[PDB]
Short mmCIF file of N, CA, C and O in Angstrom, two decimals:
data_model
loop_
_atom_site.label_atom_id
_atom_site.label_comp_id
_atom_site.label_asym_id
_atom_site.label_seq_id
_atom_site.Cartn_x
_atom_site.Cartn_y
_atom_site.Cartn_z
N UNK A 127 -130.89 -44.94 -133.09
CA UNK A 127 -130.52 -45.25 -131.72
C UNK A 127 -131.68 -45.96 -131.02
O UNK A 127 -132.75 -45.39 -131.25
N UNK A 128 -131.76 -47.05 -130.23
CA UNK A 128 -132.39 -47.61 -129.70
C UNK A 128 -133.02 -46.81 -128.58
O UNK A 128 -132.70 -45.63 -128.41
N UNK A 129 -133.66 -47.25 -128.02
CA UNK A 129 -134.62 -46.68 -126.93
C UNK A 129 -133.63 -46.39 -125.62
O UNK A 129 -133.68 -45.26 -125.14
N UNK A 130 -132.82 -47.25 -125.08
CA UNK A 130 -132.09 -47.63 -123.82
C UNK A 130 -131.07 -46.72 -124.21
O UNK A 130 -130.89 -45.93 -123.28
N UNK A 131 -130.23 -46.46 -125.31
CA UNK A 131 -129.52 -45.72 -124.97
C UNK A 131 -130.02 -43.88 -125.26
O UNK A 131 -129.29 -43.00 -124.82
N UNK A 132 -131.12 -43.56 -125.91
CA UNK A 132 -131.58 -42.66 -125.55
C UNK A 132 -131.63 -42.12 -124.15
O UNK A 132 -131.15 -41.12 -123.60
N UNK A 133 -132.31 -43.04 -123.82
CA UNK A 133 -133.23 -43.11 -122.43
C UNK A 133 -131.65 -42.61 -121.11
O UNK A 133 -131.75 -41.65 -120.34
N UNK A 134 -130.59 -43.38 -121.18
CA UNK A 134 -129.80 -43.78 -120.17
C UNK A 134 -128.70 -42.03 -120.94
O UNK A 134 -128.37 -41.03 -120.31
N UNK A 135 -128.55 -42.22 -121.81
CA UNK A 135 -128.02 -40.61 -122.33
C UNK A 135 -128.86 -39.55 -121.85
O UNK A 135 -128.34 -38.56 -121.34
N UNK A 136 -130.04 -39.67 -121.96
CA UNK A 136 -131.04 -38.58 -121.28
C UNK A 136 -130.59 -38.53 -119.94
O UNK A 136 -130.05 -37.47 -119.64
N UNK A 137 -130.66 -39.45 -118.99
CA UNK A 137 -130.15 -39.45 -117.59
C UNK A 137 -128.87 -38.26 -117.26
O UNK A 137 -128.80 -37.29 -116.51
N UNK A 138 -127.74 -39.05 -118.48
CA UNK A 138 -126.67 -38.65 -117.93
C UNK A 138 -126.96 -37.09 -118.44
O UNK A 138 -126.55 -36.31 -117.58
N UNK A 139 -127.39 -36.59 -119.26
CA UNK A 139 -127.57 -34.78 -119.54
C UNK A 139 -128.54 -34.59 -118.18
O UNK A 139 -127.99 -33.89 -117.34
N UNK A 140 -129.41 -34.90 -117.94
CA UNK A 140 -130.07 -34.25 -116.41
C UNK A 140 -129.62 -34.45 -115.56
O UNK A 140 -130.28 -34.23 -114.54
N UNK A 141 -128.28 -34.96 -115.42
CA UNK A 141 -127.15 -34.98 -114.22
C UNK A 141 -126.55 -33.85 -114.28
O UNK A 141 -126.31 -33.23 -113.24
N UNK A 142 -126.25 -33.43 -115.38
CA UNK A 142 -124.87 -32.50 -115.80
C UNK A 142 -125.55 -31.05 -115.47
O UNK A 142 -125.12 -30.13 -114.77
N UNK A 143 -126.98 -31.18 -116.37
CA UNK A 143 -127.44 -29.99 -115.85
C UNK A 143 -128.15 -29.60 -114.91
O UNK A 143 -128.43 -28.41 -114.78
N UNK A 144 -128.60 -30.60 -114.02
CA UNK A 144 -128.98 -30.50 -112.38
C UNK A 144 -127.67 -29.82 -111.88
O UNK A 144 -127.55 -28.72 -111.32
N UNK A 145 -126.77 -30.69 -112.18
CA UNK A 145 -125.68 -30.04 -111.10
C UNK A 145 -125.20 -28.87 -111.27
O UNK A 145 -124.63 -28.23 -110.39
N UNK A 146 -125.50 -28.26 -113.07
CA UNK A 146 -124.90 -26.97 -112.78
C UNK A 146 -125.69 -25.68 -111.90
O UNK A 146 -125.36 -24.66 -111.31
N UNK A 147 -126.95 -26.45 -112.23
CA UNK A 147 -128.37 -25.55 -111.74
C UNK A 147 -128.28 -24.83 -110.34
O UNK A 147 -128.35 -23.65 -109.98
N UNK A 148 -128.01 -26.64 -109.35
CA UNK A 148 -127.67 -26.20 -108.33
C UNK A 148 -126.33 -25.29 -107.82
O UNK A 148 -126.38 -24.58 -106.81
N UNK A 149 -125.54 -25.38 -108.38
CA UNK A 149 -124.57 -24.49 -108.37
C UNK A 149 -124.37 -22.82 -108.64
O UNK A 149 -123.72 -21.88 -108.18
N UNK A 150 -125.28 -23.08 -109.62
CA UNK A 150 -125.61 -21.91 -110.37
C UNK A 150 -126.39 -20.82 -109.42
O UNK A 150 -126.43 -19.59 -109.53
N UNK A 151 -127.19 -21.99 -108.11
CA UNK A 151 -127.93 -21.36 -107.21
C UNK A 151 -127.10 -20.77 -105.76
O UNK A 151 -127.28 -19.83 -104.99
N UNK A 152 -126.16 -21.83 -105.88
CA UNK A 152 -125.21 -21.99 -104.73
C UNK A 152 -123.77 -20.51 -104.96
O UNK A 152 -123.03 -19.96 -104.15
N UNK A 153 -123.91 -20.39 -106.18
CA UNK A 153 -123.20 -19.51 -106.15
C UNK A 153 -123.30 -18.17 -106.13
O UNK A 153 -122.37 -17.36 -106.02
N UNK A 154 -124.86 -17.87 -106.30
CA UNK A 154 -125.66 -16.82 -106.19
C UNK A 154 -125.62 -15.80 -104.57
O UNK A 154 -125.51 -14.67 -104.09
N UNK A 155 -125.81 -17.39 -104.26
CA UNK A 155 -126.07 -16.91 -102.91
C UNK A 155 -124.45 -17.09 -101.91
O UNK A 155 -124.53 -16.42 -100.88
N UNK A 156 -123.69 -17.51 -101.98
CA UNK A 156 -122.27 -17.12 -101.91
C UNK A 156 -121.93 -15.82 -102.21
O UNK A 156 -121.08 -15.26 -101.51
N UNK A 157 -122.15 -15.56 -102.62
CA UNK A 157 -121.73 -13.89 -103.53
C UNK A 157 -122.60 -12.92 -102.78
O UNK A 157 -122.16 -11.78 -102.66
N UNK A 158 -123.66 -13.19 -102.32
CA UNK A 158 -124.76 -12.30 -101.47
C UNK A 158 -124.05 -12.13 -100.12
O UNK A 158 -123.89 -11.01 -99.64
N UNK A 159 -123.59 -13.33 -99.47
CA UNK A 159 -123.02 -13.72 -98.24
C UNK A 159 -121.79 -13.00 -98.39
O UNK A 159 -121.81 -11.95 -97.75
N UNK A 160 -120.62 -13.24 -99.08
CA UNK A 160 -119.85 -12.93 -99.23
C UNK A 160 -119.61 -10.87 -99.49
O UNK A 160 -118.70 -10.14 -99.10
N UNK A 161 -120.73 -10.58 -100.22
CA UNK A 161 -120.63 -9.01 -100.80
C UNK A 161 -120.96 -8.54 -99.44
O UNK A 161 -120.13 -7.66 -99.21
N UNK A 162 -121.82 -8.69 -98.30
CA UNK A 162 -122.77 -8.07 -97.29
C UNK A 162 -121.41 -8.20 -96.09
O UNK A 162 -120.87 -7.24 -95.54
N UNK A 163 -121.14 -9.35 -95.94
CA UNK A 163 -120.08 -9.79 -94.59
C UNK A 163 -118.19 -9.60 -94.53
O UNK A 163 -117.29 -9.60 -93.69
N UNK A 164 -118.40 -9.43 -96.16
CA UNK A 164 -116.39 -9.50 -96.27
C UNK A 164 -115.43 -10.09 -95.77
O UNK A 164 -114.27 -9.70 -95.70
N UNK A 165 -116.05 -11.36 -95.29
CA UNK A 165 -115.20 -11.96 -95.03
C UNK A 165 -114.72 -13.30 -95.95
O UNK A 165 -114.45 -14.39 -95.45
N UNK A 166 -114.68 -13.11 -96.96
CA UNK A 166 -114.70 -14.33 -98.22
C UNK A 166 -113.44 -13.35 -99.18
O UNK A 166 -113.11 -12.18 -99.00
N UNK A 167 -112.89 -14.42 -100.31
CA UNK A 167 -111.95 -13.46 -100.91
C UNK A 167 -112.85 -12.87 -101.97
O UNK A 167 -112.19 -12.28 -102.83
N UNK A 168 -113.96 -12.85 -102.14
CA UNK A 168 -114.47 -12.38 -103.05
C UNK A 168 -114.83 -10.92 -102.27
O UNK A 168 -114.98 -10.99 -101.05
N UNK A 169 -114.98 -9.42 -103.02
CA UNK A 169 -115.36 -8.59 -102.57
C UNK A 169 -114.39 -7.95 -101.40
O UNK A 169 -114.79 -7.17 -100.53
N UNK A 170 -113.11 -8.40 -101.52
CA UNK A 170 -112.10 -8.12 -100.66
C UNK A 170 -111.21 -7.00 -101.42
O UNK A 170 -110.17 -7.21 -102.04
N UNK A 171 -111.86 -5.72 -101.21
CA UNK A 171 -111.41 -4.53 -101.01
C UNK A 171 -110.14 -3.88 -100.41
O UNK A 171 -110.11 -3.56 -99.22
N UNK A 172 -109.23 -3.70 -101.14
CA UNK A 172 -107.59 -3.05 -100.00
C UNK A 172 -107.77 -2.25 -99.22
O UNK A 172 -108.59 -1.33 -99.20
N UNK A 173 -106.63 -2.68 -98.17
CA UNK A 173 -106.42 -2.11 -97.15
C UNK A 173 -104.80 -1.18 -97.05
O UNK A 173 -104.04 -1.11 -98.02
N UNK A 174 -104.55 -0.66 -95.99
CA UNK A 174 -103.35 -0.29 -96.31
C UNK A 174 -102.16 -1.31 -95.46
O UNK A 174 -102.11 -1.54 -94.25
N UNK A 175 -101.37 -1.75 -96.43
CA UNK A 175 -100.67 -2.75 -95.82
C UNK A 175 -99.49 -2.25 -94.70
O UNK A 175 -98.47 -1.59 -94.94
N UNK A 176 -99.96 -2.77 -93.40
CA UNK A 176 -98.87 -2.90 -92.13
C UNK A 176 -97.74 -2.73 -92.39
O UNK A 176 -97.31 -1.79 -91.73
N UNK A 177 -96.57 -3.40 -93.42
CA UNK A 177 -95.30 -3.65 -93.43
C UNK A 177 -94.90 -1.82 -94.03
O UNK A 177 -93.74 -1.42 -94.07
N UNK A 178 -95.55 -1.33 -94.25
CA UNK A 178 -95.50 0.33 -94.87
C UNK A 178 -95.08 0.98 -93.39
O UNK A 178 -94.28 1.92 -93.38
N UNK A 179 -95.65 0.43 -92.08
CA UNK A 179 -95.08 1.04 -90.89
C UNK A 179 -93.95 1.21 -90.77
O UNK A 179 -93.44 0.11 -90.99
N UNK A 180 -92.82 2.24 -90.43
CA UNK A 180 -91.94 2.34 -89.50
C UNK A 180 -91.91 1.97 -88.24
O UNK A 180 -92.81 2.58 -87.67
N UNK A 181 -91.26 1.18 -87.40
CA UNK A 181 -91.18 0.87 -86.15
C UNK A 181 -90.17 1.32 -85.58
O UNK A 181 -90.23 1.01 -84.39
N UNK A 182 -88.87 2.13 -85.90
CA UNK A 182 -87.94 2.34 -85.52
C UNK A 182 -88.14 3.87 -84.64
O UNK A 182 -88.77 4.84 -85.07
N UNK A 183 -87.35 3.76 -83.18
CA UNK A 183 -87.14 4.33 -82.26
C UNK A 183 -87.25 6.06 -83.45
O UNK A 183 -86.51 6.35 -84.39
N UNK A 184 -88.16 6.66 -83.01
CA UNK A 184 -88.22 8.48 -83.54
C UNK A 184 -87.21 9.78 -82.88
O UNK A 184 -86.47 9.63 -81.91
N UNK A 185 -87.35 10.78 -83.49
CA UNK A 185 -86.85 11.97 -82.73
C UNK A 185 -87.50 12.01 -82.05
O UNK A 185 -86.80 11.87 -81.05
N UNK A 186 -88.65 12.12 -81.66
CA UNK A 186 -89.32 12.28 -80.15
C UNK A 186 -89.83 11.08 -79.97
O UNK A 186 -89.93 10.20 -80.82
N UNK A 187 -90.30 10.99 -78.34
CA UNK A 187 -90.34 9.36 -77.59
C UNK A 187 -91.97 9.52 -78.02
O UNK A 187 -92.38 8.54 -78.66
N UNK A 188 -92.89 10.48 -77.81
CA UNK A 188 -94.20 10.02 -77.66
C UNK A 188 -94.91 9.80 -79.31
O UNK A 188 -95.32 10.72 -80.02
N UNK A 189 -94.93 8.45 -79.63
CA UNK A 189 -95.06 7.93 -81.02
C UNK A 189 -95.26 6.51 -81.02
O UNK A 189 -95.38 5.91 -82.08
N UNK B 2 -115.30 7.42 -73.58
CA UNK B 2 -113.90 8.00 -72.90
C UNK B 2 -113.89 8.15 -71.43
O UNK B 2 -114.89 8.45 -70.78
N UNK B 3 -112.73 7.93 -70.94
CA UNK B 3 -112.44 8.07 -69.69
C UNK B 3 -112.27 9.50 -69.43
O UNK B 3 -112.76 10.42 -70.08
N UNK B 4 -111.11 9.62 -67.79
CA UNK B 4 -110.86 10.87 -67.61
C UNK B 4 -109.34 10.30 -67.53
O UNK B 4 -108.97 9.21 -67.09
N UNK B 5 -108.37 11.61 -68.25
CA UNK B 5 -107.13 11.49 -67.96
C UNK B 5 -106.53 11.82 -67.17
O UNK B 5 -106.76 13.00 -66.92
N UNK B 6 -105.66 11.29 -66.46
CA UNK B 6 -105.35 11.30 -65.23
C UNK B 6 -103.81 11.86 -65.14
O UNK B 6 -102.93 11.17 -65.66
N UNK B 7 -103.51 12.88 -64.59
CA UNK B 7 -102.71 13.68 -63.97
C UNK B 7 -102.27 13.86 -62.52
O UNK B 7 -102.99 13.87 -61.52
N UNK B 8 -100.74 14.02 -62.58
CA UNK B 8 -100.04 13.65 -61.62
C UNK B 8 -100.58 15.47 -60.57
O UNK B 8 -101.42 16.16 -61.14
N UNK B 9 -100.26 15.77 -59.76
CA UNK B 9 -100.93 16.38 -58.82
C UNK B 9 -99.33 17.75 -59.04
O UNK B 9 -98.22 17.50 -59.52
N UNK B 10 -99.75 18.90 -58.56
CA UNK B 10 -99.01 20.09 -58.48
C UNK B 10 -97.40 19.54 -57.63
O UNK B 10 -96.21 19.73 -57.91
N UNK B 11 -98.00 18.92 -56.69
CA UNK B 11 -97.24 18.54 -55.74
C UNK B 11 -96.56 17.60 -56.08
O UNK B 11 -95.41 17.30 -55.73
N UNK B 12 -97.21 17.11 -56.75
CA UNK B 12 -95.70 15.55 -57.73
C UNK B 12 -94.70 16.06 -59.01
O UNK B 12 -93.94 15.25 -59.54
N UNK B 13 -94.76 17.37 -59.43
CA UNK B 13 -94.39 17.79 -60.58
C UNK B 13 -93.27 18.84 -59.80
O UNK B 13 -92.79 19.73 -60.51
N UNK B 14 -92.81 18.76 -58.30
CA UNK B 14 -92.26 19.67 -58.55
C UNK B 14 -90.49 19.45 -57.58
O UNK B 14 -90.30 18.95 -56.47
N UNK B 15 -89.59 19.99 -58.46
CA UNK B 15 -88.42 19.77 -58.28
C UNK B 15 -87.42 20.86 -58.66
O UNK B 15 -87.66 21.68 -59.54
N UNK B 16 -86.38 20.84 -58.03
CA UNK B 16 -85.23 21.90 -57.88
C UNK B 16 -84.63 21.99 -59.47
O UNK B 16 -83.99 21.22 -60.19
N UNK B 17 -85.13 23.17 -59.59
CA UNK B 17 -84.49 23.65 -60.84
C UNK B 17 -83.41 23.97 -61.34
O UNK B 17 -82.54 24.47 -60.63
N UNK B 18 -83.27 23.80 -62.34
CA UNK B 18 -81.55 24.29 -62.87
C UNK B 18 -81.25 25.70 -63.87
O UNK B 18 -80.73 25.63 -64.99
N UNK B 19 -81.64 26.76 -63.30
CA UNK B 19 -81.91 28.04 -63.46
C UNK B 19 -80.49 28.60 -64.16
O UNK B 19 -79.97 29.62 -63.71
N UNK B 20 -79.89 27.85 -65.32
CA UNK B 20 -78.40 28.74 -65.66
C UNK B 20 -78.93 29.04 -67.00
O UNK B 20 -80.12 28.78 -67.18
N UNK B 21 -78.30 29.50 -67.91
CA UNK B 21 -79.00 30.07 -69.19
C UNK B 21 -78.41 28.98 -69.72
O UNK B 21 -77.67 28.21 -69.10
N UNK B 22 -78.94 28.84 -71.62
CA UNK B 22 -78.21 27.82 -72.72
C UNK B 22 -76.96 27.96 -72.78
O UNK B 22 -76.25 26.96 -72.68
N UNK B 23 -76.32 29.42 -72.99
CA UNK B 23 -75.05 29.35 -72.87
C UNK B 23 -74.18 28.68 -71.53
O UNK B 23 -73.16 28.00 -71.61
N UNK B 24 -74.64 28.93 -70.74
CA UNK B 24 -73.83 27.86 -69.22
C UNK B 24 -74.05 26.40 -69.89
O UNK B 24 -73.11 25.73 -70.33
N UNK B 25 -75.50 25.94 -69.90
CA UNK B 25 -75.59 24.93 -70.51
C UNK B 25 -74.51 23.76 -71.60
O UNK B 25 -74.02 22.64 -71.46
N UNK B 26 -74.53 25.10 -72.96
CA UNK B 26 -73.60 24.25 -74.02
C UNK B 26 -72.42 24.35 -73.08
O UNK B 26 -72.06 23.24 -72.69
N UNK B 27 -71.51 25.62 -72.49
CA UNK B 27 -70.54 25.31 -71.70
C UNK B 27 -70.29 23.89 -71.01
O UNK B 27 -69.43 23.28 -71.64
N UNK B 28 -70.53 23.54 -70.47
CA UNK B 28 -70.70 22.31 -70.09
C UNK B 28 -71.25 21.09 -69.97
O UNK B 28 -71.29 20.29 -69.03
N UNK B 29 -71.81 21.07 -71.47
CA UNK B 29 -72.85 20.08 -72.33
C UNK B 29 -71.82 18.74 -72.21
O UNK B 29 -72.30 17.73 -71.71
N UNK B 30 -70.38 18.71 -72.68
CA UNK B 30 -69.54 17.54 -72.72
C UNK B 30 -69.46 17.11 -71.50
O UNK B 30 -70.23 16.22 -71.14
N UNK B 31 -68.57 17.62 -70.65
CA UNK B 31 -68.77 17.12 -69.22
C UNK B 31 -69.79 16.56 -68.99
O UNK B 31 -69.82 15.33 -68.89
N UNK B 32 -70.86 17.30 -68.86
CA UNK B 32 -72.33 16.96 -68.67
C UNK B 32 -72.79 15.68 -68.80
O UNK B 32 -73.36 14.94 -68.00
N UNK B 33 -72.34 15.50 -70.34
CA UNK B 33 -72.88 14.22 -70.77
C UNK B 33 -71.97 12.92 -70.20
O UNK B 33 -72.45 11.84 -69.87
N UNK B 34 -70.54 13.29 -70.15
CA UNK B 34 -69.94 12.40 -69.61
C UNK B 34 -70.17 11.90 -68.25
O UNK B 34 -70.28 10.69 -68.08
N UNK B 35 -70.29 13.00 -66.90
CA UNK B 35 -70.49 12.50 -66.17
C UNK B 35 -72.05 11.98 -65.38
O UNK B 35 -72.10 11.37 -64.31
N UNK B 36 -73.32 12.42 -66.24
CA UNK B 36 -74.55 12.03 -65.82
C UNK B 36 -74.78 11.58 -66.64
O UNK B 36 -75.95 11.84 -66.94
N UNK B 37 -74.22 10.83 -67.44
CA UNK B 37 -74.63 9.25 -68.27
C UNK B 37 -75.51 8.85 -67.70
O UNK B 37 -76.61 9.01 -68.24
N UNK B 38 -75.48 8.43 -66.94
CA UNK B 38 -76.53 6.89 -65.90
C UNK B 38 -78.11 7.45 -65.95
O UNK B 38 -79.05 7.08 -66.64
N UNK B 39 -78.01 8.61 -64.82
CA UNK B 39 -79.36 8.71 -64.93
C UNK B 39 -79.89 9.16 -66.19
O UNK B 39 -81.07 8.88 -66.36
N UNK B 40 -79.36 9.75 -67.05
CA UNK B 40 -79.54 10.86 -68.09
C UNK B 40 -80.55 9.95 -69.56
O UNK B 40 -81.47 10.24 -70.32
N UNK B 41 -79.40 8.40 -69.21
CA UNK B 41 -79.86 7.28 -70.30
C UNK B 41 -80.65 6.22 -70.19
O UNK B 41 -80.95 5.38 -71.04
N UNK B 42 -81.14 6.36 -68.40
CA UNK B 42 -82.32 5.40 -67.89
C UNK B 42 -83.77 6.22 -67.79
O UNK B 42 -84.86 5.67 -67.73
N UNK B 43 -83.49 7.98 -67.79
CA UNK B 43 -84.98 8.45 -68.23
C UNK B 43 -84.94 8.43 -69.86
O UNK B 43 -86.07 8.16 -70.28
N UNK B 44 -84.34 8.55 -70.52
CA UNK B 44 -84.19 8.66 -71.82
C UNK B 44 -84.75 7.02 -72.11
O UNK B 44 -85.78 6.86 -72.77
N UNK B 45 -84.22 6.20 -71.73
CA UNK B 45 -84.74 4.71 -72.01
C UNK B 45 -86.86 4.59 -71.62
O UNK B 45 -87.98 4.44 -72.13
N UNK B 46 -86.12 4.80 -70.39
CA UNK B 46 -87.94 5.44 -70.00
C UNK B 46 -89.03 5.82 -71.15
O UNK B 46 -89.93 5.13 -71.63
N UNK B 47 -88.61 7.23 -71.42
CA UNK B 47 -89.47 7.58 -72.64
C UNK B 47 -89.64 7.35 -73.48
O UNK B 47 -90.68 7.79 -73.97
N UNK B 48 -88.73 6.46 -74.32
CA UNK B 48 -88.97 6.33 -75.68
C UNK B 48 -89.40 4.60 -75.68
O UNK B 48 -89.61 4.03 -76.75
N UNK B 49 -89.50 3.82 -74.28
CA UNK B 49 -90.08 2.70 -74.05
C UNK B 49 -91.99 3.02 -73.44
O UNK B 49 -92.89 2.25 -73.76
N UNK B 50 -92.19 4.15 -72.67
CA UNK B 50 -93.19 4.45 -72.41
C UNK B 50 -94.14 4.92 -72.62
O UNK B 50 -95.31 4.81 -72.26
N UNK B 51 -93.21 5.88 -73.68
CA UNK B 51 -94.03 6.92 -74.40
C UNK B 51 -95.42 7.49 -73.89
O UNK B 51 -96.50 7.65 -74.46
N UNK B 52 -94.91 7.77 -72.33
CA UNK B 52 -96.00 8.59 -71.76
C UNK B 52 -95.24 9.40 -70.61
O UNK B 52 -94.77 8.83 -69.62
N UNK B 53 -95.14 10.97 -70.86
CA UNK B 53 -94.39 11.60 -69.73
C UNK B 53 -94.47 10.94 -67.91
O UNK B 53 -93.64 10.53 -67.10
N UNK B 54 -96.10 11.16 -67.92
CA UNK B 54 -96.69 10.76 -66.56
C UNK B 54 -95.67 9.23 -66.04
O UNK B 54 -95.32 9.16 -64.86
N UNK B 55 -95.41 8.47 -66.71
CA UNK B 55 -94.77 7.24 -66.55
C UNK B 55 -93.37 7.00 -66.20
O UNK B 55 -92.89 5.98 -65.70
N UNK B 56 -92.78 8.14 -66.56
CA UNK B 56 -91.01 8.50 -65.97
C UNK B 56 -90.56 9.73 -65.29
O UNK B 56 -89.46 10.28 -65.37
N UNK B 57 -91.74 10.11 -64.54
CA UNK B 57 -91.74 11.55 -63.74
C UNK B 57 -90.42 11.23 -62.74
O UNK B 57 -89.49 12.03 -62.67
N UNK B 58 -90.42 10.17 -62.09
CA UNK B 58 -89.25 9.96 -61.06
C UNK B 58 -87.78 9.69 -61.44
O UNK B 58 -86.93 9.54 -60.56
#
């Protein structure tokens, strides 16, 4: 293989793995943000779901 | 917390209907027939208010 396409193949692998790097960093810290605040779908813990309510008029009024 | 607030001795009090259950069921049908009105606008009351203090009148 000639020099140039070494050289220009080298490029394109320190693209691929720059970008996962940064990601790799970006997602670290997503997951920190996300585990501490809960508001992300990650780390989203159940709740008890609303539609389980009854709303209908009771034997007694105070309810 | 707040303080809950209560209607006064003097707002709670009204002419009683002193007959026993049995007088009562005696004339539970009638009853219902002819004091419909008010009987189903406190009844609407409570179960829209769901707070005694709120349909005392």
């Amino acid at each position: 293989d000639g020099p140039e396409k070494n050289y220009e193949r080298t490029m394109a692998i320190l693209q691929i793995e720059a970008e996962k790097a940064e990601l790799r960093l970006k997602e670290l810290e997503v997951r920190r943000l996300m585990r501490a605040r809960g508001d992300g779908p990650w780390f989203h813990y159940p709740t008890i779901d609303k539609e389980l309510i009854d709303h209908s008029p009771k034997a007694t009024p105070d309810n | 917390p707040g303080i809950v607030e209560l209607p006064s001795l003097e707002d709670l009090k009204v002419q009683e209907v002193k007959v026993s259950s049995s007088v009562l069921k005696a004339a539970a049908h009638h009853y219902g027939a002819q004091c419909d009105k008010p009987n189903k606008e406190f009844m609407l009351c409570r179960w829209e208010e769901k707070d005694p203090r709120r349909c005392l009148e």
